[PDB]
Curated annotation (Swiss-Prot):
Name of the featured protein: Endothiapepsin
Residues represented out of the complete protein: 90 to 419 of 419
GO biological process per UniProt: proteolysis
Stated family: Belongs to the peptidase A1 family.
Ranges of residues in domain Peptidase A1: 17-328
Encoding gene (name): EAPA
Biological source species: Cryphonectria parasitica (Chestnut blight fungus)
Length: 330
């Protein structure tokens, strides 16, 4: 089997991407944030504290003939941005782009943090990291990808995120028309539960490439590109007036600037992030200070190849017995 679904930016900045997902019988379609940096499929629901729901579409398990309470199971998760959610668990039929999993754990939110409430466009998350990170207790549950894997034509999914435009998540096949040149594959460590890999270096603009190992995760659920402070300083030094602002919470730059590109290495291959991808717009409405899309990972504990980086590439998440990651230009 295979599946193919379009993923759409939630706003004009590409702050996140939503993908429609069919849950239950008859189908209830919710728009979920596909997150290769976590491993829970959770949804706003009829169980979510009413004051914490503001415009989201909810899953109502009592209206699904295939929903079953997973008795005794609870979940609770915190994300890198400080957001969180928790609740109980159902199993139900879940389909993405024509690919169907029966018995998928659908984690029903009883509580969500304010950032989730305030984002009316995201109805929940669909985790695509390794199932070892799944938070369901006392019986850990599998991700949608893990449940689908054996049925897939090939044990892979791909992320093809658009810049200010829709893109595609495919399951079970590699669309050879969706990228240019060849796909370069690189080793993955699953020891922390993430799609963790080692970039071979970087360049800023038309500058020379610096060969240096950068361990990080491929995380579709993080907006920005978080890299070591040395790398980030070297990038922003090429933008007149750019500075790190403690009050704002990172690097800002004059909105009048033209940003240089940023290149990252994948083995001997190179992925170029155009400068425009690094512009996250005014820090507040009407400001002439703009927020940067490359920020320091200092204090995170790991580097994060978030959407800013991934959307410059066609990315293969290869879930074979020994997982790997592939990157192609597009």
């Amino acid at each position: 089997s295979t599946g193919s679904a379009t993923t759409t930016p939630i706003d004009s900045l590409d702050d996140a991407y939503i993908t429609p997902v069919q849950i239950g019988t008859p189908a209830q379609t919710l728009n979920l944030d596909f997150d290769t940096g976590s491993s829970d499929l959770w949804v706003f629901s009829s169980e979510t504290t009413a004051s914490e729901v503001d415009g989201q579409t909810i899953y109502t398990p009592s209206k699904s003939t295939t929903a079953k309470l997973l008795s005794g199971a609870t979940w609770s998760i915190s994300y890198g941005d400080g957001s969180s959610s928790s609740g109980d668990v159902y199993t139900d039929t879940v389909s993405v782009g024509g690919l169907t999993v029966t018995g998928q754990a659908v984690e029903s939110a009883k509580k969500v943090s304010s950032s989730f409430t305030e984002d009316s466009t995201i109805d929940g998350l669909l985790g695509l990291a390794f199932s070892t990170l799944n938070t369901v207790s006392p019986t850990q549950q599998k991700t949608f990808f893990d449940n689908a894997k054996a049925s897939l034509d090939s044990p892979v999914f791909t992320a093809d995120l658009g810049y200010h435009a829709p893109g595609t998540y495919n399951f079970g096949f590699i669309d050879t028309t969706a990228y240019t040149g060849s796909i370069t594959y690189t080793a993955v460590s699953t020891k922390q539960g993430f799609w963790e890999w080692t970039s071979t270096g970087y360049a800023v603009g038309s500058g020379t490439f610096k060969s240096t190992s950068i361990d990080g995760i491929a995380d579709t659920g993080t907006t920005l590109l978080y890299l070591p402070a040395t790398v980030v300083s070297a990038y922003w030094a090429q933008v007149s007036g750019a500075k790190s602002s403690s009050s704002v919470g990172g690097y800002v730059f004059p909105c009048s600037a033209t940003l240089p590109s940023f290149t990252f290495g994948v083995g001997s291959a190179r992925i170029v992030i155009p400068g425009d991808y690094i512009d996250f717009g005014p820090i507040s409405t009407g400001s002439s200070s703009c927020f940067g899309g490359i920020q320091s990972s200092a204090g995170i504990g790991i580097n994060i190849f978030g959407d800013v980086a991934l959307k410059a590439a066609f990315v293969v998440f290869n879930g074979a017995t020994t997982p790997t990651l592939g990157f192609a230009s597009k």
